Design a protein around this ligand. Structure first.
Ligand SMILES: CCCCCCCCCCC(=O)OC[C@H](COP(=O)(O)OC[C@H](O)COP(=O)(O)OC[C@@H](COC(=O)CC)OC(=O)CCC)OC(=O)CCCCCCCC
Ligand SMILES: CCCCCCCCCCC(=O)OC[C@H](COP(=O)(O)OC[C@H](O)COP(=O)(O)OC[C@@H](COC(=O)CC)OC(=O)CCC)OC(=O)CCCCCCCC
Ligand SMILES: CCCCCCCCCCCCCCCCCC(=O)OC[C@H](COP(=O)(O)OCCN)OC(=O)CCCCCCCCCCCCC
Ligand SMILES: CCCCCCCCCCCCCCCCCC(=O)OC[C@H](COP(=O)(O)OCCN)OC(=O)CCCCCCCCCCCCC
Ligand code: HEM
Ligand code: HEM
Ligand code: HEM
Ligand code: HEM
Ligand SMILES: COc1c(O)c(C)c(C/C=C(/C)CC/C=C(\C)CC/C=C(/C)CC/C=C(/C)CC/C=C(\C)CCC=C(C)C)c(O)c1OC
Ligand SMILES: COc1c(O)c(C)c(C/C=C(\C)CC/C=C(\C)CC/C=C(\C)CC/C=C(\C)CC/C=C(\C)CCC=C(C)C)c(O)c1OC
Ligand SMILES: CCCCCCCCCCCCCCCCCC(=O)O[C@H](COC(=O)CCCCCC)COP(=O)(O)OCCN
Ligand SMILES: CCCCCCCCCCCCCCCCCC(=O)O[C@H](COC(=O)CCCCCC)COP(=O)(O)OCCN
Ligand SMILES: CO/C=C(/C(=O)OC)c1ccccc1Oc1cc(Oc2ccccc2C#N)ncn1
Ligand SMILES: CO/C=C(/C(=O)OC)c1ccccc1Oc1cc(Oc2ccccc2C#N)ncn1
Lengths: 62, 49, 54, 126, 51, 385, 385, 126
């Protein structure tokens, strides 16, 4: 048939599009992921770095 | 001897890693929805070319 | 609008996920330690020392 | 790896035997229906691996109206696979449409490559 | 009548005047989070009224 | 053009993880290769930080690991992530190779990619053997005694390869010191083979689960398969964290917390779980020279698969007989691992000999016969004659 | 085409050492880069074989090296080739960098190639510092005491970087064990930077001693520069063999055959010869914080040369004033090495302060002023006005 | 790095001064003879580094009979350098042949790039 006729997309479309609500919820979930990934990567580096400080038997002879 | 400290540190790690797993499923399903609902139509071309 | 005050300006979208994660560390560690010690009350050394004072 | 000349030699021997075509041919019809490529809208000649010089020769010599229809069936099968669904039942390939359209072009290119190989490594006698 | 020179611009920095306040502030927030639990950084950062 | 395509170092990054064309229909089995890259980084980084506190003398090796567990700040986290991380490395590698068998990824034009992967698998086995020796527990000493004594059955050179491997007359102090130095080196050779592995993959690209060409519908890597990779990265880290913090000694042997004693033999000498099927193949040949040849042939027989597969179709998706015998081979591999942890007793001796035959008959007998039959059934079910 | 051009792994070999177009007029100074590749292989291979016999505990480190010299078969050959090979590595690297200064190899379009080379030079200095600590001689202990104490003058973080570098309160047993583990690793990072160094060179090719374009007359690498490389490889090995077998302790200090004693200070604390000019720059600044900043600025000032050279001609071949001041800079570097081996006495204190000024004034004052004058003298000597 | 517009501005100021052209011009003639590029058969404009957009523009606009002669002088200088010799004395460049043939093409391309840069970063006023 004619290429100007668009097929049926109605079982996935929102009843009201409302562009300032669809963008706001998607950016909440991406922002929460970057929040938790930065706090997780920070404690990971501090676990490896603090293993080079003085051990428990060295501190006992201080 | 680390037994009481290991179980307290494990509770913080499992809670953080569970939240990052559930958030990544939502973000992957949002960013793939244009590909998953794509539609194709075939019209056979005219011969003699 | 609350997209453009929270997630548009990506001089602090990198920033707020880097500063909200700083105060996140102390509130999260205080809440779990308080729950973990209340679940195990009567078994810690501080609960033992309070009546091995004799 | 096994050539189509060898497959057609074994297969035509079974189909001419009246006792072997009563045993193997009912088993082959159950094997194809359990394979399930027709429920994705494919013919069998769409499934042949093409990364070899014989298959590249046969795909060049295919008429262009059949080459356009082959490209649509492959694209539609990739989209159905990523959605983890099957096609609607009125869009399945029927058995009278599952014909070997590419097989005569493959067998012609195989016979020409065999004749060239025999003339390049050859003996003479006075 | 003409602006600045040499593969940069004062016009490119008069719009980017008050946002390296926050792009420098993006990595003011960098060593904010990445420096925690050190014995170095607590006479100016643990003194605050909460937590 | 953009700077990610014009710079000399960023164009290698852009053509591999940003703009590389992927087939649109690959599933979650195609995510195992990037998990193996994360596992190799985890094993290398926890390895360096533990090596700052380790002593490789035979009088000091067992107490150095106990010093890491007790006195080093977060030292028990470094060891438990390292020991459990080696078991997770082998599990992801087994699933990655079984994906290649099922979908026909070994076939042309990807034979060089499959051959480099077999070299990587051999070097990973040798790495885990050398790190287990460095603990010098009771299972460390006697497992090294059994394996190194196999090489003395080689004709005319055998009794001099073993004493060149010992540095002496038995497993002793020069053996442990040279095994720790080799254990540092081989993960850097593995990292160079991974770079050669990714170069051969860039030439032809990946296959797809339908087995047919992917050149008609491609999507770029960035933000589609980057975010699909994040789902399996976080699930991998969560399950690994449950083992490190809540059950850290489930995948090990309690005899390795006894220090190594060359005068007391343990009641049972058992390897780690990921080397148990190759241990049962070795114990099923009574002659000692033929047993060590068959043990190394179980890895090298993976190279015959591009020549014994006779099918004109790539993969197992539309083949019902090849599907059945693939899962026969999978549960035969699990049974061989269970036999390798039992005593040498009736009826486990005959069961291990039949399961050893089924392993080698899959590559050399079953695959060329079944794929020839499936070629003919596709033909005569369509051709009217 | 031929198989050396169609294979995925051999085409990298063919485009680098077989078919790569070279300018026809390069001289023997362009052979130093391939000698540096041979030196890195020699240091890595002798390093692994010695590490099979080495113990890194502070009670065992000095006697382990004496055990290598006496009890290991050909063990004195392994150590003497390793220690003297480090001095030959620095001498070839100094001549390689001085070739780049003379011929203008740092200029555009080769700035990325020059910047990667400066990173390699920093990592090589850090490598040789860590290997000298592993001997734990008397010069090993007190040289590590002097250098690690410099970092405590950094504001607000200084007293906690040093104790994080010691693992304790002074140079002790955790310091030597972590320095040997870092010494194993950094040569593998150097090998990865060399690969990035060769990728940037393949993009533009080499320069030539005339300073002008080489695109008009090229000859391939194989059998012309392969056989020219063999002449300098055999001369290098002959001179290195004369030091290893006939004079093996000329380039070292006899105080390093005394075991490390933290209670007895030596009469003179002197580094190896290739670190002596940077030691004299540090001792010429009386303030302790500005002295360690100036010491690290002496390496980082090499990065300003693409911006301070103002000439429209590449190289020093046709410039008589730039030739004169290049050799002023060379003999100033030799004098700074000689001052660094003297006592802090009159008049060596003022001589080291003037020579430190001449080092920094070459890059920032002399090169932009002289190259501006030579631009104008070329113009007015030809133009009729 | 220093532009040829800046070099010509300083150099033409010296050549117009009657007291500065008596001091610097004898020093510049000794500087060129000690440089030695004329004994290899080169002019000075052969020695200018060419890996920049201004020099690639000026080399495209050179007439083709001068472009063929420039290519022969560069090739002959590379062959003389690898033999560690000098040219015969009757093949040296004379001072009346060492003319700036490329300089007017360079100065024209530099002025056009400066005018484009001033119009691209520009102010207005009402
Ligand atoms: C060991 C430590 C490593 C940890 C990580 C390794 C993960 C290995 C898992 C094996 C694998 O990779 O293949 C998985 C395969 C499914 O592939 P498929 O693309 O056809 O399914 C897409 C789905 O329909 C949409 O999946 P969708 O993307 O829409 O949602 C994601 C889903 C979780 O996805 C994953 O975690 C993938 C592992 O989220 C939810 O379930 C929502 C409710 C919470 O599964 C199968 O084919 C058969 C299922 C059983 C396989 C288990 C065999 C293990 C030996
Ligand atoms: C730690 C030490 C490791 C030692 C390992 C070897 C390292 C050598 C380092 C010295 C060096 O770098 O030499 C470079 C320098 C080149 O600079 P240049 O441009 O002035 O001279 C072009 C080429 O030499 C002509 O040498 P020529 O080409 O004339 O030799 C003839 C022949 C090659 O002969 C030889 O093999 C002798 C070695 O080649 C032919 O032409 C015949 C072919 C048919 O050679 C020179 O001739 C200049 C002399 C100054 C050397 C002083 C070094 C100061 C440190
Ligand atoms: C020398 C080295 C030898 C290596 C041998 C490796 C053996 C180790 C065992 C690894 C198990 C991995 C088996 C699965 C391999 C993945 C490939 C595969 O089988 O495809 C997935 C399969 C196909 O499913 P679909 O039909 O929906 O997709 C078709 C494409 N369109 O979908 C499925 O059917 C998935 C079902 C998976 C069940 C497998 C159970 C495995 C149990 C092993 C337990 C081991 C610990 C005890
Ligand atoms: C972090 C900062 C690092 C600083 C790095 C500086 C390192 C300096 C250490 C010494 C390096 C040795 C300098 C070698 C000079 C290399 C320069 C070069 O590549 O060639 C220059 C010159 C070319 O001469 P031509 O062949 O072009 O002559 C033809 C007629 N025009 O060729 C020549 O004329 C060769 C003349 C011989 C030079 C003698 C130098 C003496 C060096 C003394 C070393 C003392 C060590 C104890
Ligand atoms: C692919 C990489 C690696 C693998 C598969 C691997 C595997 C292993 C295994 C299985 C053990 C025995 C663990 C136990 O049961 O206690 C071990 C121990 C050890 N490994 Fe590794 N390793 C790897 C990389 C490294 C590297 C690169 C280093 C050092 C730089 C290292 C240093 C050590 C040390 C010090 C031990 C002894 C401490 C301990 O027992 O945990 N490892 N390794
Ligand atoms: C440290 C080890 C390894 C790493 C990092 C690695 C990495 C990868 C990656 C990233 C891919 C592409 C994505 C994917 O298909 O998953 C891949 C593909 C592949 N790998 Fe590996 N791999 C490793 C080991 C192996 C081994 C042991 C084998 C086989 C014996 C192997 C054989 C293959 C094959 C055949 C493919 C192509 C699959 C296809 O295109 O369908 N690799 N590898
Ligand atoms: C670019 C590479 C290297 C450089 C420049 C270098 C340099 C040095 C130096 C200067 C010393 C002190 C030698 C002395 O005066 O006695 C040393 C010692 C040592 N190095 Fe290296 N090294 C390198 C690579 C390696 C590697 C890769 C290893 C180990 C795998 C290694 C293992 C050792 C050992 C065991 C010692 C102590 C034995 C001795 O004193 O000779 N080295 N190194
Ligand atoms: C292990 C260290 C190094 C290795 C293996 C190495 C290797 C090489 C090789 C093989 C070449 C080409 C042939 C030649 O011109 O000699 C080269 C060129 C070059 N290298 Fe290195 N190099 C090293 C260190 C350095 C350092 C320390 C610098 C400078 C700070 C440097 C700067 C350069 C430059 C500028 C060139 C281009 C020279 C020209 O084209 O005329 N390299 N290098
Ligand atoms: C201008 O044009 C040129 C050019 O003129 C030249 C000469 C070269 C070639 C010169 C080079 C220096 C390239 C070669 C590079 C190296 C030799 C660097 C070495 C690289 C490494 C990765 C080092 C690692 C090597 C090893 C041998 C370590 C492994 C050690 C082992 C296996 C021993 C341990 C084993 C046991 C059993 C103990 C060019 O590449 C080039 O560019 C196109
Ligand atoms: C088909 O399309 C694909 C595709 O699908 C995928 C998944 C990838 C995925 C790519 C990967 C998974 C990359 C592979 C992973 C590696 C090569 C990892 C290599 C490992 C290393 C480099 C280890 C290096 C580690 C260190 C140097 C750490 C050292 C420790 C230190 C320095 C301690 C610090 C010391 C002190 C004193 C603080 C592709 O590239 C690709 O394109 C082809
Ligand atoms: C041994 C395996 C090797 C594998 C190689 C993989 C590549 C790893 C690189 C990873 C990304 C690194 C980003 C580089 C940043 C951009 C490059 C750049 O800035 O080059 C230059 C500046 O030069 C430098 O300072 C180089 C910095 C050294 C980098 C060492 C890590 C940018 O300027 P340029 O205009 O020349 O870029 C175009 C180049 N064709
Ligand atoms: C980025 C820096 C790292 C890169 C290093 C590059 C240098 C690597 C070593 C080069 C040595 C050459 C190795 C042999 C080359 C022949 C390979 C071959 O014949 O290809 C295969 C055989 O497959 C293999 O078994 C490869 C084994 C690799 C072993 C390397 C350890 C057949 O050749 P093919 O027909 O595929 O050639 C076309 C390639 N596109
Ligand atoms: C040092 O002992 C190592 C052991 C281990 O499991 O390391 C991870 C081990 C312990 C007890 C008994 C045996 C052990 O080692 C091994 C080694 C091993 O090696 C091979 C694996 C596949 C093919 C060939 C070999 C060999 N040789 N196959 C089985 N067990
Ligand atoms: C462990 O002692 C190492 C020494 C050595 O020479 O190693 C090869 C050494 C011995 C005595 C005195 C000092 C020593 O070390 C050093 C280290 C050193 O390091 C640098 C070099 C250049 C720029 C910065 C630094 C620093 N820090 N510069 C000079 N001497």
């Amino acid at each position: 048939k004619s290429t100007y006729r668009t097929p049926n997309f109605d079982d996935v479309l929102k009843e009201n599009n409302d562009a300032d609500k669809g963008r706001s919820y998607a950016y909440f979930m991406v922002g929460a992921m970057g929040l938790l990934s930065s706090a997780g990567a920070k404690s990971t580096v501090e676990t490896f770095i603090s293993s080079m400080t003085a051990t428990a038997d060295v501190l006992a002879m201080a | 001897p680390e037994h009481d400290e290991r179980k307290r540190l494990g509770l913080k790690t499992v809670i953080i890693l569970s939240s990052l797993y559930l958030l990544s499923i939502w973000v992957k399903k949002f960013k793939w929805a244009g590909i998953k609902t794509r539609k194709f139509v075939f019209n056979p071309p005219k011969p003699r070319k | 609008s609350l997209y453009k005050t929270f997630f548009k300006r990506n001089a602090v979208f990198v920033g707020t996920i880097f500063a909200g994660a700083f105060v996140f560390q102390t509130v999260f560690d205080t809440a779990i330690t308080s729950w973990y010690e209340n679940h195990n009350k009567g078994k810690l050394w501080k609960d033992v020392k309070a009546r091995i004072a004799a | 790896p096994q050539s189509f000349t060898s497959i057609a030699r074994i297969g035509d021997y079974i189909l001419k035997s009246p006792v072997l075509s009563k045993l193997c041919v009912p088993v082959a019809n159950q094997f194809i229906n359990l394979a399930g490529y027709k429920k994705l809208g494919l013919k069998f000649d769409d499934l042949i691996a093409e990364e070899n010089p014989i298959m590249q020769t046969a795909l060049r010599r295919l008429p262009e109206d059949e080459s356009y229809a082959r490209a649509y069936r492959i694209i539609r099968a990739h989209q159905t696979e990523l959605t983890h669904h099957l096609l609607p039942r009125n869009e399945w390939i029927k058995a009278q449409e599952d014909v070997p359209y590419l097989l005569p072009y493959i067998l012609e290119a195989e016979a020409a490559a065999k004749e060239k190989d025999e003339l390049d490594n050859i003996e003479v006698s006075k | 009548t003409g602006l600045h020179f040499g593969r940069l611009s004062l016009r490119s920095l008069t719009a980017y005047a008050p946002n390296l306040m926050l792009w420098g502030g993006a990595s003011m927030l960098g060593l904010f989070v990445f420096t925690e639990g050190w014995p170095k950084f607590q006479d100016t950062l643990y003194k605050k009224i909460p937590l | 053009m953009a700077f990610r395509k014009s710079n000399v170092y960023l164009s290698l990054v852009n053509s591999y993880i940003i703009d590389s064309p992927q087939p649109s229909s690959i599933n979650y089995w195609w995510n195992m290769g990037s998990l193996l890259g994360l596992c190799l980084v985890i094993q290398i980084v926890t390895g360096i930080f533990m090596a700052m506190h380790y002593s490789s003398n035979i009088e000091l090796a067992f107490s150095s690991v106990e010093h890491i567990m007790r006195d080093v700040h977060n030292g028990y986290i470094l060891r438990y992530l390292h020991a459990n991380g080696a078991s997770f490395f082998f599990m992801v590698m087994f699933m990655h190779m079984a994906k290649g068998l099922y979908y026909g990824s070994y076939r042309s034009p990807r034979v060089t990619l499959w051959n480099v992967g077999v070299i990587i698998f051999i070097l990973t086995i040798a790495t885990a053997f050398l790190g287990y020796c460095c603990v010098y527990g009771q299972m460390s000493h006697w497992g090294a005694t059994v394996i190194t004594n196999l090489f003395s059955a080689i004709p005319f050179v055998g009794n001099d390869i073993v004493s060149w491997l010992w540095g002496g007359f038995s497993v002793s102090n020069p053996t442990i010191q040279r095994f720790f130095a080799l254990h540092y080196l081989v993960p850097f050779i593995i990292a160079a083979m991974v770079i050669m592995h990714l170069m051969a993959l860039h030439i032809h690209g990946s296959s797809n689960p339908l087995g047919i060409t992917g050149n008609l519908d491609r999507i770029p890597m960035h933000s589609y398969f980057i975010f699909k990779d994040l789902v399996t990265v976080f699930l991998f880290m969560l399950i690994l964290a449950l083992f490190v913090f809540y059950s850290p000694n489930t995948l090990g042997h309690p005899d390795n917390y006894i220090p190594g004693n060359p005068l007391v033999t343990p009641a049972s000498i058992v390897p780690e779980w990921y080397l148990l099927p190759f241990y049962a193949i070795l114990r099923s040949i009574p002659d000692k020279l033929l047993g060590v040849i068959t043990m190394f042939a179980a890895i090298l027989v993976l190279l015959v698969l591009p020549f014994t597969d006779r099918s004109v179709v790539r993969g197992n998706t539309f083949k019902v007989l090849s599907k059945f015998f693939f899962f026969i081979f999978v549960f035969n591999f699990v049974l061989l691992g269970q036999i390798g942890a039992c005593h040498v007793e009736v009826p486990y001796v005959l069961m291990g000999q039949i399961a050893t035959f089924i392993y080698f008959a899959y590559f050399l007998i079953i695959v060329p016969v079944i794929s020839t039959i499936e070629n003919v059934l596709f033909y005569i079910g369509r051709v009217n004659k």
